[model samples]
Target: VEDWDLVQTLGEGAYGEVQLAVNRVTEEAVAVKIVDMKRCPENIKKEICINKMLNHENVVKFYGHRREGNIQYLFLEYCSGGELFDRIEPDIGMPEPDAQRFFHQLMAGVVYLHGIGITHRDIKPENLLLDERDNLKISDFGLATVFRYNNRERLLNKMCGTLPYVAPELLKRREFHAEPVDVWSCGIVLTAMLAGELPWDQPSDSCQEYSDWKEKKTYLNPWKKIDSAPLALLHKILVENPSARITIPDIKKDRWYNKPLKKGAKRP
Candidate 1:
């Protein structure tokens, strides 16, 4: 049957990945997401259902999963390139062109998921990887959910997503529309790509840096240092009012996003 071997362990994070396995029959390599079923099954099944429905270049491919006694194996596409996050250095960010390339596909993946009503609650650099071809592959849907379906929409109320990258409303634990939340996180992702750090720990009145921007429209380091071009784009996406945030079409229309990547841009 689908015999496989644990080839080797890969990167480790809060999500805990010991992935990197192979199909024994064909000896084809693949990455695997492991889950223990004895105590909690909160989102393994949930992630499987959502992941099963996805097929996109930027989003990691899901080959299907196998249930083994007290644990489970969620077989996935093997990304030989590496994790995209490590390429970024704090405060310095990535090369302009490399940032542009990575960000373009990241947006592609997000739009694809949003179009299908799926929202990845935890969108972070760690969850994004690069394929052998240097293309982006989004992984880990543990906190993802399908908020809209069959002409109806569900207001998400879950308090999740990583620090700083998480949307402002999500931190308030208030019910909110799903799409904009990702848009907000996507902006933070962009900031990380360009500035190599978060704008603030969390966007709130208590978070002084954010408060300055919220009250006075003044930006500090990271935001202050962002290039005028992308910073202009950032303002639109990072809008505090979720309803007023930029849409996918608008984001694509933004000149900075479509501008040609810097010529001879050094690799990250």
Candidate 2:
């Protein structure tokens, strides 16, 4: 940990602040998250355990953690390109080709998480970091949980993550499949990358609009503005019932994704 020197602040979340750091020994740049222990030690432990074992090309490479006095820092691969959300802002959204390229890598990352029997409870543009290579890396595993086959479809009492990306099953207080939740977030991310605005937003009252989106799947959201590429992907993702929704393997087979979008061509 001493080999790394903090360069710049990345962003802050409820639990911690992420910083861009450079390793003195290897001269490798990395993003180091400084966490507040009082926020939740269990959260830190969960991320460490899951990330150590959840290695994949598209996923962020988590090296290790270090404790200095009372502060603990989580070291991750530094992505100079910044958050996907920042890159896809309304005035400067990614090009169609770039968006498609990022989406393909994002799916590959998520599918790897699923394959390891882990559910990324929070999957949003903000959590998707890009390295120098522009490779998508899924981060923020504080809410990630292991999947239990017997517990599938049971109402998940605890709700986590951004409101807009929450699946309908989660809002209905039903036991939801973890895979669907992640996929639902993916759909929102894809839409944002393409359209440059969240369909679940409102002009006057944002919170109220999100609450409505959580309860129902009304097409009133700005999704109509998106082109055919993301539109087709969102339909398959935003299914009311997880049973009918797109699975990882199914998403790979989606014509818009696999063929036109050219996603899931390589397996992790």
Query: Which has the greatest TM-score?
Result: 1
Report the poorest 10 consecutive residues by lDDT, candidate 2: 201-210
Compute the lDDT for candidate 1.
Answer: 0.83
Candidate 1 residue lDDT tens string, 1-268: 4667777887664544557887777888888877676635666789899989999999999998877787877888988888878888988888878888888898899999988989998788888888877888888888899998996899998788887888788777569999888888888888888888887898877888787766645457777767788887888998888888998889989988988976653584
Clashes by residue pair, model 2: 154-175, 155-174, 155-175
lDDT of the candidates, in the order given: 0.83, 0.75
Q: Locate the minimum summed-lDDT window of 10 residues in model 1.
A: 10-19
Q: Candidate 2, residues 11-127: lDDT per residue as tens digits?
A: 887787889898777778877888878756677889888988878988888888887867788888777777888788683456777787888898898888877778888888888
What's the TM for model 2? 0.83
